[PDB]
Every structure is written in C-alpha cells, then in structure tokens.
Amino acid sequence: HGEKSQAAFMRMRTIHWYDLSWSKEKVKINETVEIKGKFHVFEGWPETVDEPDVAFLNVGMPGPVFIRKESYIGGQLVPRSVRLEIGKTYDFRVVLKARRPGDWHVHTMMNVQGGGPIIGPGKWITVEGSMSEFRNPVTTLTGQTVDLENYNEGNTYFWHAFWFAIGVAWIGYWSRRPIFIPRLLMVDAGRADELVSATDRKVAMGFLAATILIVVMAMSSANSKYPITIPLQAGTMRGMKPLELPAPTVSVKVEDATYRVPGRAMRMKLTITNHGNSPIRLGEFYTASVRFLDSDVYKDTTGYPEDLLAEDGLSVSDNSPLAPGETRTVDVTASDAAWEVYRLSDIIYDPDSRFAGLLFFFDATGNRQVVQIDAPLIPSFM
C-alpha cells in the first residue's frame, strides 16, 4: 500500500526486484515463511535520492505481524545497515515467522539513507491460528533461554509504576493543602515565608535522599544481577557480495518510448542485437514491480502476484526468434490494467520523465539473459 504513491520515475529507477519467490502462501502461527529474490541496483540512480551508501533491507508489513528472524544479502546475515554499490546485482533472502492471524500484504523494501523507503512488489500471505500461541525463544550467551514476547516486561512495568507512584506521592503531599488561590494570595500579599516550612523541608530532603539512594541501589542490583552486558550493536556492514552475472549477449537500444495519456499501454521501439550462439525471443519486460510477460514465449510459475503480473501484456511486433549475429528493430507494446492501477501513468505529473526496466530474453534451451534499458519517456496525446 505504501507504493502507488512514490514518484513514478523514481519507483521505476531506484532498484529492480526480480527472481522473487515466496516459500509459502498460507502458514500457521509460529511457522516460517521465506522470501528469496535478487535486486539489480540501477545505474541511473537519481541525484535527489542519496546513493545506497547506507541501506537497510526491511520487509513490508502492517506492523509486526511477522518477525524478521533472518535476513541475508548474498549469503551473509545483515541485521544492520549495509552499503550497496550502484549498478551491482545482489541476491537477498529474508526469513519471517508468523505472529498474527490475518491476510497480510508482505512487501520488500531497501530503505536508503537520504531517499527513504523503496517499496518492491508485495504478495498477500494468509496466517491462521491464535496470537497467544506465538513464541520467540532466544538463547543468550549467559546460558539463559528467554521469550522475547514477555522478557523484561515485568521489570519494565514494575519500575515505571514505582517511579510514577513516587511522583504521584510527591504531588499528593504538596496537594493535600489548598493549592492555587490561597497560595497565590499569600505570595502576593507581602512576604509569604509560611507556605514552605518544617517539616516540608524535611520531607523534600527525605525524597531527594530516597531518590538518590534508590537509584544507586537499583544500579548496584542491576549490575550484581546480569553482570555481563554489551552495548548496542551498530555500524554499516560494508563489503557485501554482489552477484557475478555473466556479461549479457544481447544489446538493446531504445529509440523513442511513448505512452498514451490517458491510457493503460506503453509503446516503445527497440533495436535488438543478438550475440552468442542461440536464437532468442523476448519474454518479459519488468518496469517497476509489474511484469509484462509474453504468453507465447515465457510463463510465470513462481506465483507472482496477479495484480502485478501481465501474462499477455507484452506484445511485440515481431517476436520471431532472433538468430545470433542478427540485429532487428521491433515495436514493443506494454499494455495492462496494472500500469494504471499502480499509477505508472502519473509520470506526466512527475518532473523527470525517464524510465528504466529489465528485459528478459529467453532462447529455445530455456536459460535467460537480463539486459537493462533506460530512455526518455515521451507522452502522446493525439
């Protein structure tokens, strides 16, 4: 839900999520669901959004309905912020444990230091059960197993109640006597020198000494008990491992890309040069969380969200196999209702009318090659 509102060109040109897969669709309580996929860091990162020098891989949910048990970028756990290199492709894998019963929209964002959240594609996940059955057991290095659902809750509530009670006792002691008008009149009418006296000064000394002594003994007890404490763990984790994708054998040049206003279609002309040793056919055009697929070339099996999937939304003027070494220019039309539902048509309201996406070329064998495009997007009206 956070998406659909982010700028158009900046949703379309910030990060690119593909090869997404969800381990399960509906899970019980206290069950594990895993999200896998990769995200090519776009080269044309806009200046207004700071570079992903300090980025954190969150997961999109309406509150802690799942707990992010584990999250990996590459093959390394990333509980802290990471540094991403522009133009590099990473593979991520986050592990979630169900916590609340209900149908939830789990997204996937890469929050950025100076840019903000970058919401990726999201999938509905059903959780059945009861919240009371959820457990989050963690074992510390001191040899104790605790449940994070109710760990330290008793101490926190008790200590806040204690200090609030002390404050209320002070207020009540100084509010037993009349408060505002008689005291104001005594202060104004000459010297008061009677509103505070023995043994109110004794009571104030008593509470000051009691506060100091209670704080000192509480520190001593919290140090005698729990003798081992470490600070908060922070710091950006640099040196993440990018994917070593082979250099694509397909070079695509974009010559003019137009979209009807108003309309649900995107029209674009490509000059495709096929290197390598296999005939290729264009199968998928991913622009921003929306997969425009050609049904006669490639079909989705990973259960991509239906609202974001266009099974026949990618129409090519000449989708015949392209022999290696042959260059052809074809018209690519990307029409689907999602292109208007997710507000990719509001780029006309958006100051930087440039687009980017992923082109997925499949051969007869089956293996694909990922090539990127970036070109100005020219609206058309007549």
Partner: protein, 241 residues
Amino acid sequence: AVRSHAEAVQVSRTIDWMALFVVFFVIVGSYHIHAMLTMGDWDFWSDWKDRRLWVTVTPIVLVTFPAAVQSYLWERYRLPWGATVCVLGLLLGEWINRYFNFWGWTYFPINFVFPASLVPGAIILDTVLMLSGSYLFTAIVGAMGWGLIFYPGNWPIIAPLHVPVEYNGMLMSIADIQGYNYVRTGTPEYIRMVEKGTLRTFGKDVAPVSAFFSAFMSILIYFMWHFIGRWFSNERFLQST
C-alpha cells in the same frame, strides 16, 4: 459577597482541583508534542535507546518544559512540583500511547516500545528548587542532577535488554534482537542514531561523558527556559490586537 468562610474554602478547593486539571492536561499535550518531536525516535525503541546519543540528547531537549513550569509555579505559588507534574504528564501520555496504539492498535511489545524514565530527575530538580530556592543554584546543581541521573536511573529497565546473544553468527544484544525481529516499516535500522564508535573513545567513557554533556547542556537549557517561562507567565493586556 461569599456568604461565609466555609464555602469560600470549598470554592477554593474546587478551583484548585479544576485548575490543576487544566494545567496538568495542557502540559501533557504541549510537553508531549515537544518530547515526541525532539526526542521521540530514541524513546520509541529499546534498540534506539543506546548509551551515547539517547543519554546525550534526551535530558537536553527534555528539561525545557520543567524549567518554565518551575519558574512560574514555584515563584508564584510556592508549589515545588513543576518538573514533577511535567514529567508525570509526559509519562502518562507516553504510556497511554504505547499501550493503546503501539501495543493495542499495532502489536509492538511493551518491553520493546517502553518509554524512558524521568521521575528521578524530576524529583531531584524539584527538591533542589524548593530547598535553597535560588534559581541559579537550581540551574546548576539540579540541572546537573537531571542530566546525570537519567541513564543510571533508567539502567534497571534496559540492563536486562543488554545481555549479549550470539544470533546467527553475529554478536547481538537483546534490544538489537528485538529491533531486528519486530519490523518497524517506517523506521529502518540505519536511521538509528546511536553509538557506532570513534577513534577517540576510550573504553568505558561513552556512558559518563555523554551524561556529563547532557548535564551541562541541561544547565544551559534550564537557564534559558527559566526566562522563557518567566516571559510566558506575564499578565500583560494588549490594548490592540
């Protein structure tokens, strides 16, 4: 005029209670706005509650309203609980919000979204104001106490959350595990303005040095907000708007 002495006392009692309600709740609202827009982010999350920036910032930006409310209440009514009422109102607002929105509306755990504790500092500041009523003496000694007893006063609550844990091959504190597990969509991990170390921090110095910085800047903030409250407590009438 008033018929007799008795109902005059009754009316004074009613005015006391009713005006106490008014001032307490206005202070709740305004002081909560101030805290939640100047120290809210650190106060929201246990993992955000570190020992450098939380301890540095919270007293400095949070001693503002107690200074003004003392400078009015004590000076005018000899009521030595301006800071105490400010802090109690702030804590009441924080706890209502945390229990009915963070834990009621959303489902962040209480042990994860508990607010800070400030009653020790408030009590020290108010009793130092009352005994030896010098406002400058308060602004030095009581402000130092407010800035210095913050972290040790709050230590028994967050100490159980600092037990080290080996979490999937990385050393992690229990507060860090809570922050990692319970996903806050709008508050990513890098925004966390906490200690990350420096070339010039020497072992066990982050907690005390930050506390002393907080005490000093609390002295300064108390000194300026005393006069801010003095100005706000004026009884001037404008002849034209």
